């Protein structure tokens, strides 16, 4: 019998051209002939049948005989003849400046860059941030470091520390009385200082590890040619055997009068030179709610305008609960969608501007136009791939209707030497640790010939709302939609974190956890959901249960740590219905 | 035929004989019960189920007798019961199905679970007062003088460090030293304890459990004599007894120890600020307390004579000592040779103790004294079971007062059981007592074969910087498997909540993962030093119920930004530092 996957995938990495076959199917001469044209030897592997099904499953091609070129799977002869007919194959076989060109200095980009060079490969990293419509820009690290997870969590923590001052008093700390205010200017500088240290850290790390970095915006001008333009306007050509597109997304604006003129975004909020003041958040996304949250927590009057539901994609039971709590915490929610934004005042520094927001509200006997004045309006409806000016048409990299790249796993489904990871990969969950993992693993497949795949199912999340929401697996609905109400047990409880027991927090009547189980398969766990302080820290480890098809019986036989919130998952007995 | 069927038959039936192949002397048994007008039901076990059944009940050989749902052993054991007159008394009707001695974690758990299975139950709690005369209500050690108050006083200490963080994040707090009022904290705490005490007392009445606030002693084979506070003495009778008395603080045979020093029992209800404080002992209790006492502003000293946290990973213990040292706690290897009272505590002010220590100078060794306001004895906790009359029912004890068990069954007496701290070699933890109680009741009254899982129990020490652990220490692992077969993976990190601060904790957070190299880095233990160690550890502990490998941690996607995600990216190997 033939070879196994292991042997195939390493020989594919080692060898310049590889043909992997099962039976001596015709057209294999036709291959050797094709590469004859280019003075190229063609190595060869007889695979076992025992192994065909797996190998095809990994590389994502349908049928038995496979070509690999400089460690990239092309498909069958059908695919190969297109590359040659197009002239691509001739260009591809030529020596190139870099082993791998990475477009994007984000979570995935930097992860991939570090992992690649660890496997001794010549790598170039291109980061450039086209500025917000208000003209905001930033350093190396991408969305998370500069305008995402990092600043957001720090501003959440600020808002929590506010609620902690009040707790301090109930525990006996004699704090001088008088309203305590939050100075925005201090928080903002505090945050931006850390972002600076990260930016610098990442820039160092690349130099320390021998990775070329260019602060230049890149566009494909040939089959293996990026044209890259820097801040000055200087333009260079870069060449590589492989490309990774790790471009991520940018805040979405709606096609409304005054939107791009009058409203800030995620990109702008974390470096504002003024206290945002009376604030309107437009959108139901996790971003809208998370933000909306902390601004109220640092003392601002906050309003959230939604089109229909909060957190579309998340458990709408859990979403409704967040809304009830955030409501009791003085955030105002409304059904409206603005029809126009009008600027009344420009911000100075040290002072915000004034926006008039136009809505159309409905009574019993009429529909009539309404306005309300806010200091600052945050647009937070979505994030979109900005890939038009990339020249993916030049390399023939297919995109979805959204700007996202359609993959065979991380491989462009059209072009075999161009790959994509993180937010820009069609249907990739838009989370930092996913980009990083997808990057690290891909590099280990390409340059080591391992069969390791990133696990994009059962990913734990946390929404950093005023009272945090942690989740893993299916929602109550999805489970019922899929399996039917008669076959789903939901176990749940309410509870009071001990840290809140001697206080009069509104959070005391809102903490809730629940466990969603397949009744016909020993209460196998499909999902869990918790509303609590430190939801992030609780969820992460319990998420590993779903990598083992854990049953409710496994949760019940686990001994608790007391006193913690987490132990509550150890003692669920009440059934939802 | 199989185990299940045997154990249910045993629950259903008054008298059961289980055999595999009949031996003589089995008539001699049925003849014995004939004397009691008693039917003797009978079961043929299959050979396949023999090995399991013996393993569950913990007896060596084939033939098994069960009496009112309790396993007695073979004929050898049965003739003892009859020769002793115990068998005749046992078969008589009794007032209660189960008498529970102790209103603690296990006692109350057991009582609730028993009555849920529709059984007549009596619960006996009484608190013999501290040497200083302190007493308290229902709920036992955890509720009144353990986990609950301790965690609340820890939380107080943390909120202190949070005020300082609030300022670095931009909260304008009026400047001037902020002091903590002990009297407020103490009343805050004791109010919650009151609500718990009252809650539990109600819950028993709500659920139809008889509660007697009376100290119990065995005066017959099936008779407890119980004395209440007034001095009134009552007789209680039952078919079964659960002993769940737990432990009490240990004092040394040193002049003035009991006179001059307080304990855990006294500390959480002190009418005074403890002031300058000496903690005697290296136990988790000594350190946890020393911790929060320093955190609310007191001058704290810890006297230990040997290692810290004996039983715990001495790497992690050393790390805690350095941190607690940087936080102003003073550690000394002396052991007091006498305590002398200088002042009585009075008028919500503390007293003054003179502590005598033997030190070494250049040419010799000499006596020394130092003055503390308050000395807390944290040597350990011991079983106070002499005045229980376990000698009457012939319940064997270990050299310490703890009850020797066949699992939770007294090894000597088949209708007396023990759980929680007083059960020889039970880990002394609230969730263990509770589980042991809940499960036992389900075994006794349902005939299930479910065992409490006493291996791989997660803990957290609530030191100023929390320590969470599960599984083997790095030492145990090497002792057991040998250095050549143990991988330790580890890393340092900085919780984001601390990034913009000047906290000492920034240079002390550390996690590590202990792995069996020769079995795919199977995980034997993990250890983390961090904020919220309790909440992080709980879920990761379930990994050890599935023999998780390092490869399972690496393929888990993280939640960002959290501390917990650090376990998903360990790459560095400890090389004997
Ligand atoms: C407000 C907010 C909060 C978030 N909070 C969380 C959270 O709590 N947890 C979490 O897991 N995720 C969170 N996310 C999502 C997370 O930040 C992203 O999913 C992640 O950063 C994506 O990484 P990436 O490398 O794929 O893209 P990015 O992080 O966006 O990096 C892409 C980089 O490529 C650069 N680039 C783009 N085009 C070019 C070009 N032509 N040439 C050169 N460089 C180019 C971009 O400017 C950017 O520098 C949050 C996102 C936002 C907006
Ligand atoms: C300071 C401190 C901190 C702790 N922190 C933690 C922690 O953080 N996490 C954790 O998991 N564990 C912790 N523990 C341990 C925990 O308190 C015990 O493990 C747990 O309470 C044991 O419960 P139990 O049911 O075995 O006994 P207990 O809760 O001690 O119940 C025994 C009760 O029975 C009563 N009794 C005794 N004799 C008689 C009699 N003859 N008749 C009637 N009643 C009687 C006693 O007065 C007492 O009320 C801590 C302990 C202490 C002291
Ligand atoms: N007379 C004494 N003086 C000072 N410390 C003491 C003491 N007796 C016990 N301790 C400490 O107080 C702690 C509590 O004792 P313990 O009975 O719980 O020990 P262990 O947990 O090892 O069984 C122990 O760490 C013990 O340290 P040693 O192991 O060095 O004894
Ligand atoms: Au290779
Ligand atoms: Na008890």
Author numbering:
A (entry chain B): 10 to 586
B (entry chain A): 12 to 588
Task: Please give the exact wording used by the authors of the publication that reports this structure.
We also solved the crystal structure of BmTrxR, being the first crystallographic structure of a TrxR from a nematode, which, surprisingly, is a fusion of a large TrxR domain with a Grx-like domain at the N-terminus lacking a typical Grx active site motif. Helminth TrxRs are members of the high molecular weight TrxR subfamily and are selenocysteine (Sec, U)-containing homodimeric flavoenzymes. From there, electrons are transferred to the mobile Sec-containing C-terminal redox center of the symmetrical subunit, that, upon reduction of its Cys-Sec motif, reaches the solvent-exposed surface of the enzyme transferring electrons to the incoming oxidized Trx.
Crystals of BmTrxR, were soaked with 500 μM NADPH and 4–5 equivalents of auranofin for 72 h, and the resulting structure was solved by molecular replacement at 3.1 Å. After the refinement process and geometry optimization of the model, an anomalous difference Fourier map was calculated from 40 to 3.1 Å and contoured at 7 σ. Its superimposition on the difference density map (Fo - Fc) contoured at the same σ and calculated on the refined BmTrxR structure without the metal, clearly shows the position of the gold atoms in the asymmetric unit; an electron density associated with the anomalous signal of a gold atom is present on C22 of subunit b. The gold atom is found at the expected distance for a Au–S bond (2.3 Å) with additional electron density detected from the other side of Au(I) with respect to C22. However, the low resolution of the structure and the incomplete occupancy of the metal (∼50%) prevented identification of the ligand. As expected, auranofin, a pan-TrxR inhibitor, also capable of targeting SmTGR, was here found to efficiently inhibit also BmTrxR and OvTrxR.
